[PDB]
Design a protein around this ligand. Structure first.
Ligand SMILES: Cc1ccnc2c1NC(=O)c1cccnc1N2C1CC1
Lengths: 405, 550
């Protein structure tokens, strides 16, 4: 077809990211996958006169024992000019949502000749016994931000009928996926979904539950009798927490803590301390007022490892003004390895951010870069790749959220 | 032998123009020569004369190559190279000996001056212009890849991969590996068969103007592979020669420690501690240094190690990969990867500069990881591990550590010393243990501090510190507490760094003081550490805390 010209934000130059080593197993899969798309004329071999590169790798979704090829266009998306695609607020509320992989669509559409160079990628060779194997895209690539863009038109068309005939159903598209939300009981939803697939096929468990993601309150322990320690632990938490709710007060409790007593020593509460506490439990019964999403600012996701397979997180834009927070328990089977648990976690959270703000959060990961670089891909299963940084969990922010109900 | 191959489009960096440097003046014999030589490749069609419509120029030189009292030429493309675009990767990393599968036989074809067999982009040719002056004050340009110009290797590599796609296809049971101007081909055919094919290949390159040295004049095993000696059924560590000498200069020692360090990889046992000591204070790279006797015995013991040559084996895909690790000292590990016991594929060692605060398990963890990576880079796969640590130990540590961590399928090997947890903080206060409320404060500007404690048993201490800092004070508070406590202790502190230790429970640190505490932690039977907000009323933080602030 006639191709739309895509360009780089002014001043920028193509991506020159190095390829990460790949296992034999997945290098094989990529070759197969590529020789094929080559024949199919989707991609073409390139020379060294081209100096750009983007990392590539392979993964397999659940219920799919067929390798799938994934590219890391983050860098390129960062450098690709913007254009404007609309996000609802309805699926946020839907009783259920279903995600759909429509990445395929793109491979029908051609990509502007001059932007192709920028899409160069490389299949490496085990032990470097051979030189790498350079390709470049000729059609819209999956995982690129321009693709859902350029394929906008056609897309809307293809859908309008299902749209118009079902305005009680929400459809949001975020890159390679399509989010479908309806309150219709499962029967109708599932069936109506499959009907939608067909609607698409025609042109060429698993369910989500939006609502139910309610932020949890911070519950405080209760004892029959308290010890010096217990209090100190409690007071420590409250003190820090006051940075969120400034109505929290700790003096009456801190008063009992005057005197050099043993940690195990038991202490009875003064009626004043009793109140101060009861008053605190109240304030904590609800999220801090005044926190409103700001579309113009980056969404941030912090994760703390809690051990025992547990993890806690908080999405926010300004420290202490969380938009959302939550707990996550390890998927059945990851009983021995952290990295697996974390990626799964990362994916679930990114998902919610999408559904909610239609935007991927920037992650702050409690793991050493090297560890993460070496194995995240092994367990990755989403077409998109969020942004991340590696950090050191302050001990306090951890004890706090451990207290979530 | 120019070739009939598609030239690769080449262009100058974003908005720059070709070279324009003056040509040096030359002797009668440095001009005579270059005239001859150039008239040579001129006739060979390699270079073509140019007129005045070319404003560029590169300085041509003339140096009589050693072991031939005949003259040779050299062109200086420094500038041109600065102006030429960049290419992708002329070397994605070197194939390591251990990543090769054995072969019944391996030839190597020097595709030598094939650099000049590949025609250069007609358009670009104009920037390659250079000048042959005359006695008292002749122009040319290249029509083929010039020796020493940025894109040659790259252009020549890809050129090569193309020209090889066909022959490779037909003969898949064959194996070519390329690198530079050296083409390595191996296989598992019978020598006569191998022989035939090599010749077959040869006449293939031979078809694209690509002249190759015949069987009568090519190289033969062993092959010196940068560091290794290569036989098709085994490789060797080409013995290293330590120059025995009279007087030593600083510089010499460095170079020596350099080669020694390189060696420690294959030869663990090698040491350089005392030898390194010889540099402390060194005023000049050439000042001579007296070799301490300790340095003698060491330098000596190292020659003995480097005596025994070391041969290894190749990769056999039909066998599993094993990686075994050993801890040689604190933050020092040795590892050997093999398929059949004692038949080593690769070995190495690591030194971990303690850094902020670590612990052996964490460090063990990082080793695995590093190994895992290079394994993949070589065998496109990762080894099963034999680790000097108990599953119990590992389990206790990781399920609790604050950071995400993991170790691929591994198995405990009882090869002492094992890595263990030197101490573990109590999860809750110890009943029937003294309780030390510690606190430390220091004047930031004057660096004057006090550290101290008071217990629930009525015991107390305090100490004045000169030339100290806050963190130190705080820590010190804690050190004292530990010193004066006994086997079971409870310690409350308002320190931010105490929070550190708690969450990490490090068994090594850069800070001597920390180490001090760590040593003391290890001595204790049961220790429980607690943190409380500073400057709040929390008694303890009010009494020992009150005694140390003014
Ligand atoms: C230096 C080098 C780099 C990569 N591969 C090889 C070689 N050279 C060899 O001599 C060699 C030795 C054993 C197995 N393959 C070998 N060859 C293979 C190509 C025939």
């Amino acid at each position: 077809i006639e191709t739309v010209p895509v360009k780089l934000k002014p001043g920028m130059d193509g991506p020159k990211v190095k390829q990460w080593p790949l296992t034999e197993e997945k290098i094989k899969a990529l070759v197969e996958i590529c020789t094929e798309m080559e024949k199919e004329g989707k991609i073409s071999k390139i020379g060294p006169e081209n100096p750009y590169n983007t990392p590539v790798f392979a993964i397999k979704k659940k219920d799919s024992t067929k390798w799938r090829k994934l590219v890391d266009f983050r860098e390129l998306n960062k450098r690709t000019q913007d254009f404007g695609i609309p996000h609802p607020a309805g699926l946020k509320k839907k009783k259920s949502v279903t995600v759909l992989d429509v990445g395929d669509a793109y491979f029908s559409v051609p990509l502007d000749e001059d932007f192709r160079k920028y899409t160069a990628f490389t299949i490496p060779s085990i032990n470097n016994e051979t030189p790498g194997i350079r390709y470049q895209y000729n059609v819209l690539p999956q995982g690129w931000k321009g693709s859902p863009a350029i394929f906008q038109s056609s897309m809307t068309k293809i859908l309008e009928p299902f749209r118009k005939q079902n305005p009680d159903i929400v459809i949001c598209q975020y890159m390679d996926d399509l989010y479908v939300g309806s309150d219709l009981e499962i029967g109708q939803h599932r069936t109506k979904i499959e009907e939608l697939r067909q609607h698409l096929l025609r042109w060429g468990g698993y369910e989500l539950h939006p609502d139910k993601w309610t932020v949890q309150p911070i519950v405080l322990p209760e004892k029959d009798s308290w010890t010096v320690n217990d209090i100190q632990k409690l007071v420590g938490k409250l003190n820090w927490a006051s940075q969120i709710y400034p109505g929290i007060k700790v003096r009456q409790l801190c008063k009992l803590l005057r005197g050099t007593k043993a940690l195990t020593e038991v202490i009875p509460l003064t009626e004043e301390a009793e109140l101060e506490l009861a008053e605190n439990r109240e304030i904590l019964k609800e999220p801090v007022h005044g926190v409103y999403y700001d579309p113009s600012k980056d969404l941030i996701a912090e994760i703390q490892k809690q051990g025992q397979g547990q993890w806690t997180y908080q999405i926010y834009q300004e420290p202490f003004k969380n938009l959302k927070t939550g707990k996550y328990a390890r998927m059945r089977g990851a009983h021995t390895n952290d990295v697996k648990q974390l990626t799964e976690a990362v994916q679930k959270i990114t998902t919610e951010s999408i559904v909610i703000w239609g935007k991927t959060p920037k992650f702050k990961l409690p793991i050493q870069k090297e560890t993460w670089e070496t194995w995240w891909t092994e367990y990755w299963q989403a077409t998109w790749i969020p942004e991340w940084e590696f950090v050191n969990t302050p001990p306090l922010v951890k004890l706090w959220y451990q207290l979530e109900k | 032998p120019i070739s009939p191959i598609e030239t690769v489009p080449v262009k100058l960096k974003p908005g720059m123009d070709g070279p324009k440097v003056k040509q040096w003046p030359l002797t009668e014999e440095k001009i005579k020569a270059l005239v001859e030589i150039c008239t040579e490749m001129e006739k060979e069609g390699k270079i073509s004369k140019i007129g005045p419509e070319n404003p560029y120029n590169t300085p041509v030189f003339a140096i009589k190559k050693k072991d031939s009292t005949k003259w040779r030429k050299l062109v200086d493309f420094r500038e041109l190279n600065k102006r030429t675009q960049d290419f992708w990767e002329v070397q994605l990393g070197i194939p390591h000996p251990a990543g090769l599968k054995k072969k019944k036989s391996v030839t190597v074809l020097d595709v030598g001056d094939a650099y000049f067999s590949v025609p250069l982009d007609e358009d670009f040719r104009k920037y390659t212009a250079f000048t042959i002056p005359s006695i008292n004050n002749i122009r040319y340009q290249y029509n083929v890849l010039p020796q020493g110009w940025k894109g040659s290797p790259a252009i020549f590599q890809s050129s090569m991969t193309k020209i090889l796609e066909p022959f490779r296809k037909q003969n898949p049971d064959i194996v070519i590996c390329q690198y530079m101007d050296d083409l390595y081909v191996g296989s598992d055919l019978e020598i006569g068969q191998h022989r035939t094919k090599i010749e077959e290949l040869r006449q293939h390159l031979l078809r694209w103007g690509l002249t190759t040295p015949d069987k009568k004049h090519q190289k033969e095993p062993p092959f010196l592979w940068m560091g290794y000696e290569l036989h098709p059924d085994k490789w060797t560590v080409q013995p290293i020669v330590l120059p025995e000498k009279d007087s030593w200069t600083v510089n010499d020692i460095q170079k020596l420690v350099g080669k020694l360090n390189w060696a420690s990889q294959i030869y663990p046992g090698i040491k350089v501690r005392q030898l390194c000591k010889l540099l402390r204070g060194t005023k000049a790279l050439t000042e001579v240094i007296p070799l301490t006797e300790e340095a003698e015995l060491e330098l000596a013991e190292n020659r003995e190690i480097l005596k025994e040559p070391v041969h290894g084996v190749y990769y056999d895909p039909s066998k599993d990969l094993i990686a075994e690790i050993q801890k040689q000292g604190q933050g020092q590990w040795t590892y050997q990867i093999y398929q059949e016991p004692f038949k080593n594929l690769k070995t190495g060692k690591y030194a971990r500069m303690r850094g902020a605060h670590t612990n052996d398990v964490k460090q063990l963890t990082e080793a695995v990881q590093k190994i895992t990576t290079e394994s993949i880079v070589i065998w496109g796969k990762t080894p099963k591990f034999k680790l000097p640590i108990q599953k119990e130990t590992w389990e206790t540590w990781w399920t609790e550590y604050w950071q995400a961590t993991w170790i691929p399928e591994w198995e405990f090997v009882n090869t002492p010393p094992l890595v263990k947890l030197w101490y573990q903080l109590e999860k809750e206060p110890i009943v029937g243990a003294e309780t030390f409320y510690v606190d430390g404060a220091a004047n930031r500007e004057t660096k004057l501090g006090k550290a101290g404690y008071v217990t629930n048993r009525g015991r107390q201490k305090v100490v004045t510190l000169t030339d100290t800092t806050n963190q130190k004070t705080e820590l010190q508070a804690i050190y004292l507490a530990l010193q004066d406590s006994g086997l079971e202790v409870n310690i409350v502190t308002d320190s931010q760094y105490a929070l550190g230790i708690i969450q990490a429970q490090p068994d090594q640190s850069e800070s001597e003081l920390v180490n001090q505490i760590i040593e003391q932690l290890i001595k204790k039977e049961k220790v429980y550490l607690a943190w409380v907000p500073a400057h709040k009323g929390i008694g303890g933080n009010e009494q020992v805390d009150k005694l140390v602030s003014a």
